[PDB]
Amino acid sequence: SHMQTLPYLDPTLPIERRIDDALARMTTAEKIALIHAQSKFSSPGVKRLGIPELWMTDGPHGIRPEVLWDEWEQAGWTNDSCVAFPALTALAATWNSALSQAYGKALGEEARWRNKSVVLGPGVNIARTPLNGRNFEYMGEDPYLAARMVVPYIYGVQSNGVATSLKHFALNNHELNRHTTNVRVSDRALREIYLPAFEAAVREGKTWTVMGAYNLYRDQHLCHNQYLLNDVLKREWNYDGVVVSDWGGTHNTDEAVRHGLDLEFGTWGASNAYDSYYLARPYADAIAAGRYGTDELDDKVRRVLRLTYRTEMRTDRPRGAMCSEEHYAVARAVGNEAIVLLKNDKNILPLPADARNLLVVGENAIKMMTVGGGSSSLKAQREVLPLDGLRARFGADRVRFERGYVGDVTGQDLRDDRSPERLMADAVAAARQADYVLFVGGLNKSAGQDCEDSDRAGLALPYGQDALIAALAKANPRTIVLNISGNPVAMPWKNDVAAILQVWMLGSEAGHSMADVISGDANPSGKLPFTSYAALDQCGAHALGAYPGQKRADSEIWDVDYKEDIFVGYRWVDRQRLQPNFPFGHGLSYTTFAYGRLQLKSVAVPTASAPLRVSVPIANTGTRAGQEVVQVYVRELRPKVDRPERELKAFRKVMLQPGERQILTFDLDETAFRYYDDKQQQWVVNAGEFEIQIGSSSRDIRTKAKIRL
Amino acid sequence: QTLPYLDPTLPIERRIDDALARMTTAEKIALIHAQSKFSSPGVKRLGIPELWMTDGPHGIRPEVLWDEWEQAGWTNDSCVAFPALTALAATWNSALSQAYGKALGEEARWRNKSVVLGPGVNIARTPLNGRNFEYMGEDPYLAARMVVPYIYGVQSNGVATSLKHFALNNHELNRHTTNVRVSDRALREIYLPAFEAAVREGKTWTVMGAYNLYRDQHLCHNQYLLNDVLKREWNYDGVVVSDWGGTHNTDEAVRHGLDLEFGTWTAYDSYYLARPYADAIAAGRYGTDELDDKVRRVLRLTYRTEMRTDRPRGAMCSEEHYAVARAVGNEAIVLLKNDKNILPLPADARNLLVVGENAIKMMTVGGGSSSLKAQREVLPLDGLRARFGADRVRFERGYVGDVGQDLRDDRSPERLMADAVAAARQADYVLFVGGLNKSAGQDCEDSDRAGLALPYGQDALIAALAKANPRTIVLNISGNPVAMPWKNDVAAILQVWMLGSEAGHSMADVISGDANPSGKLPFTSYAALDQCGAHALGAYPGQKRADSEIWDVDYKEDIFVGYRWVDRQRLQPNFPFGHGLSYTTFAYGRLQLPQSVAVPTASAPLRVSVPIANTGTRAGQEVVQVYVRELRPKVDRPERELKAFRKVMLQPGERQILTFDLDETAFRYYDDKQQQWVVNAGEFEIQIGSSSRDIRTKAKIRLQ
Structure with missing residues (x-):
């Protein structure tokens, strides 16, 4: 009654020996069920053999709350309150590789606590245009900066046994028509701008999951693109991981089989018909009919099993934790080094130790930035608002607030029954009798700002913030502007205000990280990961008239031409001798x-x-x-x-x-x-x-x- | 320097003392009560994992919503439905009981569950108790010898067992307001032996208190049985969890030894071990020593389960797990009658007629806590047709009881019997598959049986089939004994129980002869209701108090329970305790x-x-x-x-x-x-x- 341990269940055997034995014991139906989803964020695995399920979790900056089995709706769990870490555009602004690993390690421990196999992150799409609504979760516009900051991120998460997902392995550089956009970019611009970040994350970062984007390349979707997934990723770069599709990116069975789609998720509105996936029954009926054999199937299963053995099959993985003192300190330390000091005229910053009577103006001073944005939504255990963070540091009675403007709206009643002009009238009326005016404005996570599935209408700040800042600077020269944005914003008021800071979306410890910089407890050390254009035409993608693309005549596909070629971001303004408001890598200190x-020689x-x-x-x-x-x-x-x-x-x-x-x-x-x-x-x-x-x-x-x- | 509570190279109690010293009072209060329907929050900051309870002494209950009893709609919780615990006890095989627990623990590890709400070893003092099907008979020694290997099997995977209803929960009528009055002799010789063996020998990590009362105290916070007997006399170091809804007092839950609270009626901050406890500690009425004892035990439960890493990962719906449920069923079927060696059927047996609702009715779905989403359940008709294919097996409905399964039959009770007897004339054998079900009033948890007779008029149906054909065979699917006025009219009678996934296949192995029946009755099959000591002395429901809502049941039969009563009174039941024929x-x-x-x-x-x-x-x-x-x-x-x-x-x-x-x-x-x-x-x-x-x-x- 003492049989020998099966090879795939034997920890003493090499990993490739166990995958081969597990593959030989799986039926064709079990192989096909392994490569597509059973829920919104889960794959079934092999329940008969004991191969566990793979649970994907959203959020490159945190752990998304638990959703229902089939819907995007929140499941209503009361144990999924996480620590919201600063956005990847802020982590890249630190230029600190040591913190990027501590960032990933703290996130991986939270993923382990939630029993999540793969974290859908990070995203390293090059900021081609300042209108891309999803640039807030990327690492800027430079291929070298993003590459040296994605590797520690992947090392940190995967050190806990949780896989990273190279988000949008493609040319997904704008959210407009992202499902029908065919990018036509030159090979030179492909290898020097858009690929170096993904290559260093695969060959050096050793990522276990690489996510294809919704867009197309050479008339093929990137979730099943023969040129970039097979010829470049799996063959040229010798990638041994899994190519997971973005939730909705798969659209053809024949391409999904032969072009290298290993794991399918979110296939279409609704996605609860899991037997109708392009790698489910249509793949099964085609194998039964003899159209395909099992070569492409066994390759996809061998990779998904390899991902399972690197994660759920392991035993020495740390259990992790959530909302711990160390995780809050990491998010606090990242934010202290992510804030970029743009302007500091006459050394107005930091504020003196006797800073009394301060005026805070702006919706972003009291508006939460962790909830909303679709996939970037997070139920943070607590979010320190910029107003509350500046109150605990400078004294609540020494800090006053005026709304200033209204934008949009976790149970926060941000409604204000004052007209936009009346909000500005009594806000500048308090600026005349204030020592310092701390303006906390910028974008948010609504559709059209820092949010997926949409792009910005322009470079200027919405809600008429250009007029509110110019009026506050006219009534008080000591006006300090705190800009919360993942993209650069137009600044027709930079010569009127005294100090300008790019504080990004820091998440949980946002207010405490801003107060550490404003007070002087933390010396600002963040550098910009993009070019802060003074106008939209300073961007090469918009200067050459090639941002949305052109819709085909007898089709629904959009052909966009990356005519700026390798000259993207600061590479364009340096060649054209243009002078932005603040250039790439800009950063002042105290x-x-x-x-x-x-x-x-x-x-x-x-x-x-x-x-x-x-x-x-x-x-x-x-x-x-x-x-x-x-x-x-x-x-x-x-x-x-x-x-x-x-x-x-x-x-x-x-x-x-x-x-x-x-x-x-x-x-x-x-x-x-x-x-x-x-x-x-x-x-x-x-x-x-x-x-x-x-x-x-x-x-x-x-x-x-x-x-x- | 790794912290001591995270260092696996240290003794478990040293890790608990260090983890306890790092928890705040609020974290201690949150640990000892629930946060959802089947989970406790643990210590999220310190990394102490959560505890996930799961229902099913015979399987793994499908996932429910976070704060609701409704099913969550998951499509991965299809498990293997193992036979009821009344069938496992009918095997009298301790080796099968351990393999039963080992297979169930692996499915618990698969669903990532910490504690299995089982097994229940409540002595069946009355044939009318609704949930006797998940218990282990009427004899304390048989239950004590079958519960220990069951616990060894489950806890070998790192999944704790929950010794269900540590009390006198022997009937479900007024189960929340019933105070049991029993002597010390009957308590020590009948009702406690099964629990003491599971605690001292089985080493169960979790004990569940029942809904009833003993000495005017609910058993989820009873000073006499939880403190004096369990934690003191038996030196119990595990967790005394409560049944879902059994806690009713804050003061008693603190002193009488309640370690983990679940399902308290209301939300989770309003539990008897939640804000009322946290306020009484800050006000100075209760100390933290009794609180630390609860945390010490809950952490000990966590360190024996989710804190470990060397546990087996588990699996679900494997060939081994189906083979275990197959073996349990083959040795659980009890051959009661076999006149003239009518069984086993010949190898060329044809012209077979199957009659009964339980021949095409699933017994794994329904029953509240006993409900399971079985990946497959071989119906008795499917198992007999797989063993005798082609046209060798015909079927007639016979009767209707109750009801994704379309059990509709638009025929009168007279027409159903007329079609059954017309086909019984032109049949070599009559395989009647009847019994009870999991609806309210039969083998269900929140009710009792109305009587000992078969419901839906099965007595007139079996008598009509036996008259139309002397080669009629009766298969009884029930967790309680049933009346048999047709005993002398039927050729062969089998007690097949609720076998779960491999139900129809186990029956075909016994009927055809591929397996020799080796099952014995775990209870005394009474011929009449008054043959039971609890009912002869008129003391089954109890007496309703005048002012209060508490019912007082008095165990008047004392130690003479089951066969101990029919032997003293020299009564002749249909089949005695431990009865079971063989080929x-x-x-x-x-x-x-x-x-x-x-x-x-x-x-x-x-x-x-x-x-x-x-x-x-x-x-x-x-x-x-x-x-x-x-x-x-x-x-x-x-x-x-x-x-x-x-x-x-x-x-x-x-x-x-x-x-x-x-x-x-x-x-x-x-x-x-x-x-x-x-x-x-x-x-x-x-x-x-x-x-x-x-x-x-x-x-x-x-x-x-």
């Missing part, structure tokens, strides 16, 4: 930093083992202590093809004390100087003079040298 | 006693031996039952009591020797004057036979 000349092409060392002295020459993101840019003098004026190829964040001096050394390999030749279809470095630019921003270059390769 | 025969040799022996102990038992031989042509299993009788006792004692049994399989012609080690627990009684278990010196008659009345060998012995 203490000036000093740069030295590069230590570093004529050397050959560097490699990964033998890199080109570049040293730079960094010194703190102020009175306060803070962090500084030392950015490194590389420029090619005479390239064969068109290249931007500079490209970010290295960066490092270092904490310094007042009077401290350190020597930062960078190892530059062939990736810092190479470019993708679309003819030969390969990367190649061309010999010549290269200029190494190092400074506090993409335009605040402090030291520049030259070297020939 | 083969068994012969018993002379009982071998040692050469005025002293009172045995656990280290020096009284060894008895009896030769057993299969004197037939077919292989089969026999349940050899040992009974002890005291000729001249001090207090009243029954004519014989079950004290040992062993189930042995014998090939045709094979003879073995069965040696039983009888210690002091086979000859002792409980005297209410001394409040102890004492052994009286004198002559004891050791009786061994195939039933409680089919004594094949006997021998007297004197103890000193």
Whole structure:
């Protein structure tokens, strides 16, 4: 009565041996049921063999509350209150890879507590246009910044045994017509802008799940695209994970079988007909009819089983926790380093230790940012509002509030029975008798702002915020603007206000992270992950007239042309000599930093083992202590093809004390100087003079040298 | 430095002391009561996982809504429906009971459930109790010997058992307002032995208090049985959870030893161990020591279950789990009558007629807490047609009882019987499959039976089929004994119970002959209702108090419950306790006693031996039952009591020797004057036979 342990249930055997044995014991019906969903966020697994279910959870910034089995409606559970972490556009603004791993590790522990197999995150779609409503959960517009910040995120989550989901593996750069948009982008712009983030997340980040987007590429949906899923991801990058479809992205059985769709979810309105999925009975009837064999099926099952063995089949996974002191400290520490100090004229910030009589104006000062937005919705255990955070730090009796404007509306009765002009009248009337005016405005998570399935109508702030800020700055020159947005906003009032900060959507500890910066308890160290355009025409996608695309005559497909090519974001404004309000990598601090000349004659092409060392002295020459993101840019003098004026190829964040001096050394390999030749279809470095630019921003270059390769 | 409560290399109690020192008073209050219908919140901050209770001593209940009894609509909770616990006890096989629990625990680990609300071992003192089907008969020794392996099987997977209804919940009428008045002798000899064995030997991690009252105290917070008996005398270290709705007092729930509260009527902040408890602690009326004891036990339950990692992952609807339910059913079916060896049917048996609603009616869905979404349930008609395909099996409805299953039949009760007897004339055999169901008034949890007779007029249907054909066979699906006025008219009678998923397949294995019936009756099948001691003395429902709403039931039959009553009164039931035929025969040799022996102990038992031989042509299993009788006792004692049994399989012609080690627990009684278990010196008659009345060998012995 003592049989030997079955190979797929034997922990002492290698993982690939157990997957092979489990595959041989599954029936064809069990193999097909494994590759598609049984509920809204779950797959059945193999209940007969003991292979557990895979439970997908939403939120790259937190754990979505439990929903009903089939509907999007909340299940009504009282144990799914999570810790809302700052948005990925804020995490990327930290430029701190060490925090990105602590961000992911804290999120993975919360996913383990909720018994969730895969976290639907992170998203690393390049911010092609400032109107994309989903850019708030991405990592900016630079392919190098997003790449070096997605790898620690994936390492953190997967360290707890929970898989990460590379969201929208595609060209999903705008939400308008996202289900019928066919992107026509050049191969050069594909390999240098939109792919580097996803490649470093696969080959280096070792992500176990890669999600395809709703859009199309080369007349094929990305949830079953032969060019990017098979030829690029699984073959070229040697990807051994699962390609999960976005909830609704699958549309063809024949393509889902042969183009590499391993796991199907949310297939269509309603999605409760799980037998009618494109990888369910239509796949089963086609195998029974002899149209397909079991090769593509066994490959999809071998990958989904590999995802199951990396997660639910494990035993040494941490149980995790939720709403713990450590998880709140991580979200607090990320927000303190995510806030970007844009403007600080006459050193008005930080506020002095005797800051009495302060006026707070704006809806975002009292409006929650964790609930709403569709997939980004989160039931936070508690959300510290900017007004409440500034009250606990400066005293409740020393802080007063005026509504200012009304936008839209967790049980918060944000209604205000005052007209828009009357709200402005008594708000500027209190600004005349106020020492400081802290304006907390920006966007929100409603349709058309920082929300999925929709895009912005323009760059200007909605609800007429341009007039309210200009009136507050006219009645009080000490007006401080706190902008909550995942996209850049127009600022026709930057010369009238004293201080401007990009505070993003920080989540739970939002008010406490803003108060730490306003008071001076935390030195601002965030750098912008995109270009803050002064107008919408400064964006290359809108300057060349190619943002929504063109609908086909006898079809419902939209053909959009990425005519800006590799010149996206700061690569466009540097070539066109345009001057934005604040450029990529911009970030001020409460203490000036000093740069030295590069230590570093004529050397050959560097490699990964033998890199080109570049040293730079960094010194703190102020009175306060803070962090500084030392950015490194590389420029090619005479390239064969068109290249931007500079490209970010290295960066490092270092904490310094007042009077401290350190020597930062960078190892530059062939990736810092190479470019993708679309003819030969390969990367190649061309010999010549290269200029190494190092400074506090993409335009605040402090030291520049030259070297020939 | 890993925190001590998260370090697996430390003893469990040291991890509990460290976890307790890190919890706040609010976290301690939230831990000991529920947050949903079947879950407690645990300690979300410290990482202490939640505890998920699940219904089903025979399976895993489908998922319900967070704060509702309605089904949640999940499509992954289809489980294996194992036979009722009254069928498992009918096997008398301790090995099957452990495999029964091992398979159920694996399905509990699959659904990610911490505690299985089971097993229930409430003594069936009356044939009218609604939920006797999920209990283990009327004898305390049979229940105590079948509950321990069941608990070993479930808790081997890291899923705790819930010893259901630690009380005297022997009937469901007025179950919430019933105060049981029972003597100490009947309490110690009948109603408590099954629970003590499950606690001391089975090592159950959770004990559930019932809805009724004892000494004017609800058993979910009873100082006499939860504190004095359970936690003190028996040294119980587990959790005393409450039945869903059994807690009714805040003061008693704190002092009388209630560890986990669930289903309190109202929301969750208003539980008797919630805000009323948190306010009384802050006001200074209650201390935190009694609170820490509750947290100490709930954490001990969590550290034995969800806190571990080495537990098996489990599975659902596997070949092993179906094979276990198949084996339990084959050995649970009790062959009552088999006149002229009509069974088993020949290999070329054809022209078979099946009659009855229970032949096409599912027995796994319905019944409230016993409801299950079985992935498959082989109906008796499906099992008999799979064994005899083509046109070898015909079917007629016969009768209608109640009712995704379309059980509609637009025919009068006279027309249904007329069509059944017309087909019974032109049939070689008549396989009637009747009994009860899971509706209210039969084998249901919130009601009792109206009587002992078969409902829906099945007596007139069985008599009409037996008259039209002498080869009529009756299959009774019930958890309680049924009246049989047609006993002398039917060729073969089988007690097949509720077998669950592999129900129809187990019946076909017995009817066709692919398996030898080895089941024995776990209760006394009374011929009439007044043959039960609880009903003869007129003390089944109790007496309604004048002012209060509490009912007072007085156990007047005392220890004489079940076969202990019909033996003293010399009554003749239809089939006695431990009755069960077989397709083969068994012969018993002379009982071998040692050469005025002293009172045995656990280290020096009284060894008895009896030769057993299969004197037939077919292989089969026999349940050899040992009974002890005291000729001249001090207090009243029954004519014989079950004290040992062993189930042995014998090939045709094979003879073995069965040696039983009888210690002091086979000859002792409980005297209410001394409040102890004492052994009286004198002559004891050791009786061994195939039933409680089919004594094949006997021998007297004197103890000193």
